[PDB]
Curated annotation (Swiss-Prot):
A divalent metal cation 1 binds at residues 128, 139, 336. Substrate binds at residues 108, 216. A divalent metal cation 2 binds at residues 139, 208, 241, 336. Cotranslationally removes the N-terminal methionine from nascent proteins. The N-terminal methionine is often cleaved when the second residue in the primary sequence is small and uncharged (Met-Ala-, Cys, Gly, Pro, Ser, Thr, or Val). The catalytic activity of human METAP2 toward Met-Val peptides is consistently two orders of magnitude higher than that of METAP1, suggesting that it is responsible for processing proteins containing N-terminal Met-Val and Met-Thr sequences in vivo. Protects eukaryotic initiation factor EIF2S1 from translation-inhibiting phosphorylation by inhibitory kinases such as EIF2AK2/PKR and EIF2AK1/HCR. Plays a critical role in the regulation of protein synthesis. Keywords: Acetylation, Aminopeptidase, Cytoplasm, Glycoprotein, Hydrolase, Metal-binding, Phosphoprotein, Protease. GO terms for biological process: protein processing; regulation of translational initiation. Interacts strongly with the eIF-2 gamma-subunit EIF2S3. Binds EIF2S1 at low magnesium concentrations. The chain holds residues 110 to 478 of 478 of the full protein. It comes from Homo sapiens. This is Methionine aminopeptidase 2. Its EC number is 3.4.11.18. Its cofactor is Co(2+); Zn(2+); Mn(2+); Fe(2+). Binds 2 divalent metal cations per subunit. Has a high-affinity and a low affinity metal-binding site. The true nature of the physiological cofactor is under debate. The enzyme is active with cobalt, zinc, manganese or divalent iron ions. Most likely, methionine aminopeptidases function as mononuclear Fe(2+)-metalloproteases under physiological conditions, and the catalytically relevant metal-binding site has been assigned to the histidine-containing high-affinity site. Also manganese has been proposed to be the physiological cofactor for human METAP2. GO terms for cellular component: cytoplasm; cytosol; plasma membrane.
Length: 355
């Protein structure tokens, strides 16, 4: 059919043949084609997830306004996301919680139950959310502002991210991507409220390889010089994301934790403790190795689960991912796209008309 104003028509119902739009195809900076065609169903899954992502974010940009609580923004975004991705257990759904980190906080912040935070006119909000089909995760994010005073900061980071995307490729050394991203990032200077800053990358934050049902596969893409010389390989999927800040350029754990994720390497652990055993079963059935938040547990009817959750974390079965913020008073911005290192080319599968 044809998608409605407020999204409601699943992406699979808009492409009856099962073939989904490709993202932007670029050349790296027959045989290799047969190989590409061999994993076509995989690429296709990534695309379906991206189309869901592109329509969801365009919807968000249409109504996100200061005055709304952070919980309303996330629940409205997630509702639409579940609809378009046509959530089906672990076969299709949300890959991780809706990040909406504010101001000096760069990532991993999503409201828990009872959070009364309200989006403000001067807020710099990072919307980071993902969708997946068969575990093929699409990690893509953008920054939201209402005050044009951040325009230059946003452009700086957007330009740095697209620079990282362009420098990415097969045999490209990872430290060369980080060196490039920083050089562009620091080529920007901004003025916010009578003070000037040279945008700086958040050195302890970075891009990452993506694996099936594993948001952070194992390889990291730095956004500053001095990284590993490890190379990007053929067929890998990468999340290219950069963060710009007017602070120290370093983030630290802060505020209450809302993000949690099962340790991908841990195996079966028999638990006799009633509540802890139940919570783990719920995580395995609903999220598997995909990240989740406390709101997604409340949603499923769970209550009195914090202690059980803490046990799982203490056991090393679940890992907490608290908000990562720069110093108080600073501003941070982010832009992220997922790219596929296909044999015949480089596809920025999450690319949209928006960014
Ligand atoms: C490990 C972990 C937990 C929660 C969210 C992310 C994330 C979001 N965008 N990129 N990475 C990663
Ligand atoms: Co992300
Ligand atoms: Co990411």
């Amino acid at each position: 059919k044809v998608q409605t104003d407020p999204p409601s028509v699943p992406i699979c119902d808009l492409y009856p043949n099962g073939v989904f739009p490709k993202g932007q195809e670029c050349e790296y900076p027959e045989e290799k084609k047969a190989l590409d065609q061999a994993s076509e169903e995989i690429w296709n899954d990534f695309r379906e997830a991206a189309e869901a992502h592109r329509q969801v974010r365009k919807y968000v940009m249409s109504w996100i306004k200061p005055g709304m609580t952070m919980i309303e923004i996330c629940e409205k975004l997630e509702d639409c996301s579940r609809k378009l991705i046509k959530e089906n257990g672990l076969n299709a759904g949300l890959a991780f919680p809706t990040g909406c980190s504010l101001n000096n906080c760069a990532a991993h912040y999503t409201p828990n139950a009872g959070d009364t935070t309200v989006l403000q006119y001067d807020d710099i909000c990072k919307i980071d959310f993902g969708t997946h089909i068969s575990g093929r995760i699409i990690d893509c994010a953008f920054t939201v502002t209402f005050n044009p005073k951040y325009d230059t900061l946003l452009k700086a980071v957007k330009d740095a991210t697209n620079t990282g995307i362009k420098c990415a490729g097969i045999d490209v050394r990872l430290c060369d991507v980080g060196e490039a991203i920083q050089e562009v990032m620091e080529s920007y200077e901004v003025e916010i409220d009578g003070k000037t800053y040279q945008v700086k990358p958040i050195r302890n934050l970075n891009g990452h390889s993506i694996g099936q049902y594993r948001i952070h596969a194992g390889k990291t893409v730095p956004i500053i010089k001095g990284g590993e010389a490890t190379r990007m390989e053929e067929g890998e999927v990468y999340a290219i994301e950069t963060f710009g800040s007017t602070g120290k350029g370093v983030v630290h754990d802060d505020m209450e934790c809302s993000h949690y994720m099962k340790n991908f390497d841990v195996g079966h652990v028999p638990i006799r403790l009633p509540r802890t055993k139940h919570l783990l079963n719920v995580i395995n059935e609903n999220f598997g190795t995909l990240a989740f938040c406390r709101r997604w547990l409340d949603r499923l009817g769970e209550s009195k689960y914090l202690m059980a959750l803490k046990n799982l974390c203490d056991l090393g079965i679940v890992d907490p991912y608290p908000p990562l913020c720069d110093i108080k008073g600073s501003y941070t911005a982010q832009f992220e796209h997922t790219i596929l290192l296909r044999p015949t080319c480089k596809e920025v599968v999450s690319r949209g008309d928006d960014y």
